[PDB]
Structures are given as structure tokens and as C-alpha cells.
Amino acid sequence: MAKATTIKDAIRIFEERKSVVATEAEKVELHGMIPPIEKMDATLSTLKACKHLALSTNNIEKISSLSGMENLRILSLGRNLIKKIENLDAVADTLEELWISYNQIASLSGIEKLVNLRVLYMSNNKITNWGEIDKLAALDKLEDLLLAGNPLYNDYKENNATSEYRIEVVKRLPNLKKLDGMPVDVDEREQANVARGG
């Protein structure tokens, strides 16, 4: 994206500033955005079609169009900043595929929904509020959560308590299947296997 005003204005402004192919499409192959984004009118209307929102370097200070965001599914981010919960509930409700390799975050409500989600890939992210988040992210429930880079995971210990997390999932927990992926390390197919029953 370029800026954040109206759909028509903004989308022509993406064709000019970003220099790209929008066509009110599900598939918006963009590359960046400015922190001061206000109302996302593009989202608001393009909602109908919204699916493949592709960014690379963006920031989000205000997001009034939550009801607009309410149709997103494929978030193909790369690098971004999130600060205040003004749309996380809507995107989280309608989302499924949070592909967002690098993402800065802090809100309890936001993380609760967007993490409680079906599938999310966060190989780099910023979260540290274990006190709440550790459980509060609907941990026990959640299906596919990849949180490879982040103070929280780094605090458990990203290369020692990882295999422990999964062994404990398969052995002890009901729902949750992919508690960070990485736990495999070659041992989930040996310790976890012997622990299940061979």
C-alpha cells in the first residue's frame, strides 16, 4: 500500500505509489505501508473479494475498518508492526491463514483471538507476557501455532523445552496438534513414540 483513505483513492494511489496491481482483488500483491494507516476503506469495500492480502514491510497505528477486515483469510505478511487492538478481533474471527514471518505485538485481547486462530506462522514476533499469554492464547485448545522467534518462546527455551512441549502435547493434551512444529528435532518420533507405546 501507499496511504489509507478511501478505496478508490487508495487503490489508484497503490497503482501509483506502491506501483502495483490491485483491481479490488482478493490477491493484492503489495510491498509496504505507513504506520499512520487510519480507516482501511480499501478493505471496507474490497471485503467482498478479500482473501490474499500480501504485504512485506508495514505498520499499523489505527484500524477503524474492523467490519471491513471481517472477510480476510490469507494474510501473506512478512515484516510488520502492530500496536493497538482495533481490528485483531475481526481479522481473527474470519482469518485462518496468518502467514506473518516477522510481527511486533503486545495486546492481550488481540493475541488471544489472532493466536486462538486455526493456523499461524510467526517465525519472528514480539510477545513476552507469559503471565497471561502462556495460557490466555487459548494454548490448550489451539491447533497450528508456529512461534519460533519471540521473548515468550525464547524464555521457555527455544531449543531445550521445545521437544518437551510437543512430547507433552501428544502424551498429555487433547486438542492442540502443532505446538511450534520445531519440537520434532528427530526425538518426537522416538521419545514420544516410546512414550505412546513403542
From Swiss-Prot:
Entry's Gene Ontology cellular component terms: microtubule; motile cilium; outer dynein arm
Record site feature (Controls the orientation of the C-terminal helical region), residues: 182, 185
Pfam families the UniProt entry points to: LRR_4
Localization terms from the record: Cytoplasm, Cytoskeleton, Flagellum axoneme
Effect seen on changing residue 189 to E: Reduces swimming velocity
Keywords of this entry: Cell projection, Cilium, Cytoplasm, Cytoskeleton, Dynein, Flagellum, Leucine-rich repeat, Microtubule, Motor protein, Repeat
Xref: SUPFAM superfamilies: L domain-like (SSF52058)
Gene3D superfamilies registered for this protein in UniProt: Ribonuclease Inhibitor
LRR repeats: 49-70, 71-92, 94-115, 116-137
InterPro entries, alphabetized: Leu-rich_rpt, Leu-rich_rpt_4, LRR_dom_sf
Quaternary structure and partners: Interacts with OCAD2, a outer arm dynein heavy chain. Interacts with tubulin (previously called p45) located within the A-tubule of the outer doublets in a ATP-independent manner.
Family to which the UniProt record says this protein belongs: Belongs to the dynein light chain LC1-type family.
Miscellaneous comment as given in the Swiss-Prot or TrEMBL entry: Outer (ODAs) and inner (IDAs) dynein arms contain the molecular motors that generate the force to move cilia by ATP-dependent reactions. There are two mechanosensory systems that monitor and respond to the mechanical state (curvature) of the axoneme. One system involves the central pair microtubule complex and radial spokes and the second system involves the outer dynein arms.
Protein name: Dynein axonemal light chain 1
Organism: Chlamydomonas reinhardtii
